[PDB]
């Protein structure tokens, strides 16, 4: 019932630069003992949440001096003085004063880095899968930034639509890049009808689309 809001929802930042995440509660979190029941968490990709700041301004044990918290009753600020690549992830505020306890929706920190075009790889369907009646063609985009990227599938130069799916990683905690997987799925019979399989990649780091392809059976 107590509403925790956050701004921004997405925060791009160049390493070495400061970042500020704001939080707001729909009512005061100050207690009769003068505690402000406001807590800050960071959840890194693939990990459970991690406490950074407790009761508005207290740094949890192990947490670098880079992190500080401040606030005025219902408005609070998590501050990072020198953002590092390792700080990528989702930052949550929370109140543990009025049941039901509540978290903010999270602010995703994005590390800004130099544009990096993807390296691109295409994998034909395995013979093992073909035996099962299906054919998946996989296109890998590796170590790129920014995240925005367009993958187009072409079979015998025909543009495919509606028969692929893709997945993107979270941002890497070391080099601040992304990778992406796209799978084109066909009947085995339809795979064996056509010759040229290509994935065409459009990305800001590429002066013109890159195409990786193969001919079925060499």
């Amino acid at each position: 019932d107590v509403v925790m809001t956050q701004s921004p929802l997405s925060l791009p930042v160049t390493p070495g630069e400061p970042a500020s995440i704001s939080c707001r509660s729909s009512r005061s979190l100050l207690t009769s003992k003068g505690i402000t029941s406001l807590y800050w968490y960071l959840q890194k990709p693939g990990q459970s949440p991690q406490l950074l700041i407790y009761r508005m301004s207290n740094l949890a044990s192990g947490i670098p001096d880079r992190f500080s918290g401040s606030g005025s009753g219902t408005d609070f600020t998590l501050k990072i003085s020198r953002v590092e690549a390792e700080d990528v992830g989702v930052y949550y505020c929370a109140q543990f004063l009025v049941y039901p306890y509540t978290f903010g929706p999270g602010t995703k920190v994005e590390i800004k880095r130099t544009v990096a075009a993807p390296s691109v790889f295409i994998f034909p369907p395995s013979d093992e899968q073909l035996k099962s009646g299906t054919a998946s063609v996989v296109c890998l985009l590796n170590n790129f930034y920014p995240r925005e990227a367009k993958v187009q599938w072409k079979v015998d130069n025909a543009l495919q639509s509606g028969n692929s799916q893709e997945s993107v990683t979270e941002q890497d905690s070391k080099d601040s890049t992304y990778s992406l997987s796209s799978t084109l799925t066909l009947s085995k019979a339809d795979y064996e009808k056509h010759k040229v399989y290509a994935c065409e990649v459009t990305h800001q780091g590429l002066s013109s689309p890159v195409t990786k392809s193969f001919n079925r059976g060499e």
Partner: protein, 215 residues
């Protein structure tokens, strides 16, 4: 060292029941307060339940979303807390964390679905290049047609982590998940290293090790 370890997650019918455990160690348990917090895929954190200690008469508190259906409890002699979940709904699907609000477990996954368990097929993604080509090669495993999430993928029993990407699974039109796990290596590395992807799908007790070799 403080350790919190959740267990008991799995696939269950709407309307069904499940009991989660959180085994703890590394700290005096008698006066510590604990919580369950859950997170659905791609979504934020949702506090679910709070249980206090003996001197508080093991007082409990619940999110409105689970009241009358879930029961948080603790066994001080086994330094463990539990989440009894009854009348499960599809909306209850999420990773469930046990936490003291400072330390958090790794989480256990609960999936509420009328679908049944199905183990994956594991197919090789053959090396892109050859060994005399220089430059970068990519190889991987396609882990397809499984339910429910999650699957664990390692390479060379965990010895290989540099260059690995294990992608979020996608739900196929068939209602079954698929994912790929890839690794890049220097082309000349091919044919001097062996590459095996280790797939574990606990809900179905499928374990598969697939050697991926150049075609």
């Amino acid at each position: 060292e403080v350790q919190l370890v959740e267990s008991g997650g799995g696939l269950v019918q709407p309307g069904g029941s499940l009991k989660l455990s959180c085994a703890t160690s590394g700290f005096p348990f008698s006066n510590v307060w604990m919580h369950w917090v859950r997170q659905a895929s791609g979504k934020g954190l949702e506090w679910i339940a709070h249980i206090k200690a003996k001197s508080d008469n093991y007082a409990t508190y619940y999110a409105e979303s689970v009241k009358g259906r879930f029961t948080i409890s603790r066994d001080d002699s086994k330094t463990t807390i539990y989440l009894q979940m009854n009348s499960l709904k599809t909306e209850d699907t999420a990773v469930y964390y046990c936490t003291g609000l400072d330390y958090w477990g790794q989480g256990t996954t609960v999936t509420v679905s009328s679908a049944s368990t199905k183990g994956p097929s594991v197919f090789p993604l053959a090396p892109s290049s050859k060994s005399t080509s220089g430059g970068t090669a990519a190889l991987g495993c396609l882990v397809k047609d499984y339910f429910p999430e999650p699957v664990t993928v390692s390479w060379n029993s965990g010895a290989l982590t540099s260059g690995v990407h294990t992608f979020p699974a996608v739900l196929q039109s068939s209602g079954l998940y698929s994912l790929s796990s890839v690794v890049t290596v220097p082309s000349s590395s091919l044919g001097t290293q062996t590459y095996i992807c280790n797939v574990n799908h606990k809900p179905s007790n499928t374990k598969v090790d697939k050697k991926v070799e150049p075609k």
